[PDB]
Chain A
Amino acid sequence: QVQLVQSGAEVKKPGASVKVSCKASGYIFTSYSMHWVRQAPGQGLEWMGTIKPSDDSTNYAQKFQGRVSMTRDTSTSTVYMELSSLRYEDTAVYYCAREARGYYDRSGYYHPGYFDYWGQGTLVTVSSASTKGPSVFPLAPSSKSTSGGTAALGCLVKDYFPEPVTVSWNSGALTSGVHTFPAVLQSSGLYSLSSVVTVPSSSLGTQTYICNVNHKPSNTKVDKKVEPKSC
Chain B
Amino acid sequence: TNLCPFGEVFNATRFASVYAWNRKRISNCVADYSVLYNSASFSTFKCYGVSPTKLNDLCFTNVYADSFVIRGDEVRQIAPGQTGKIADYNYKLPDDFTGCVIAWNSNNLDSKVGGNYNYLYRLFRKSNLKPFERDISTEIYQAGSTPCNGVEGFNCYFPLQSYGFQPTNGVGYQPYRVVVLSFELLHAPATVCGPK
Contacts and interface: CB of A to CB of B under 8 A. Distances in A.
User: CB–CB under 8 A between A and B in the complex?
Assistant: yes
A28 B48 CA distance: 15
A105 B37 CA distance: 9
Contact of B96 (A1, A2, A31, A105): A31
Interface residues of B, number: 20
A101 B53 contact: no
B95 A104 contact: no
Interface in B73-111: 79-81, 83, 94-97
Contacts of A30: 96
A116 B53 CA distance: 28
Contacts of B53: 104, 107-108
Interface in A101-142: 101, 103-108, 110, 116
A108 B52 contact: yes
Interface in B22-70: 37-38, 42, 45-48, 50-54
A37 B96 CA distance: 25
A103 B96 contact: no
A107 B79 CA distance: 19
Interface in A71-127: 100-101, 103-108, 110, 116
B47 to A, nearest CB: 4
A101 B79 CA distance: 9
B47 A101 contact: no
Contact of A101 (B42, B48, B50): B48
Interface residues of A, number: 17
Contacts of B94: 28
Contacts of B48: 101, 103-104
Given A101-B80, A101-B81, A31 B45 contact: no
A107 B96 CA distance: 22
A32 B49 CA distance: 12
Contact of A104 (B51, B81, B96): B51
A8 B51 CA distance: 41
A110 B45 CA distance: 12
A110 B37 CA distance: 14
B130 to A, nearest CB: 12
Nearest to A31: B95
A27 interface: yes
B52 A106 contact: yes
B50 A104 contact: yes
A32 B47 contact: no
Contacts of A27: 81, 95
A113 B162 CA distance: 32
A217 B22 CA distance: 55
A82 B46 CA distance: 35
A1 B51 CA distance: 29
B81 to A, nearest CB: 6
Contacts of A2: 81
Nearest to A107: B53
A86 B52 CA distance: 46
Contacts of A106: 37-38, 42, 45, 52
Interface in B96-141: 96-97
Given A104-B46, A106-B52, 8 more contacts: A27-B81, A27-B95, A31-B81, A103-B47, A104-B48, A104-B52, A105-B47, A106-B45
Interface of A: 1-2, 27-28, 30-32, 100-101, 103-108, 110, 116
Which 5 A-B residue pairs are closest in the complex by CB-CB distance? A108-B53, A28-B95, A31-B95, A103-B46, A104-B51
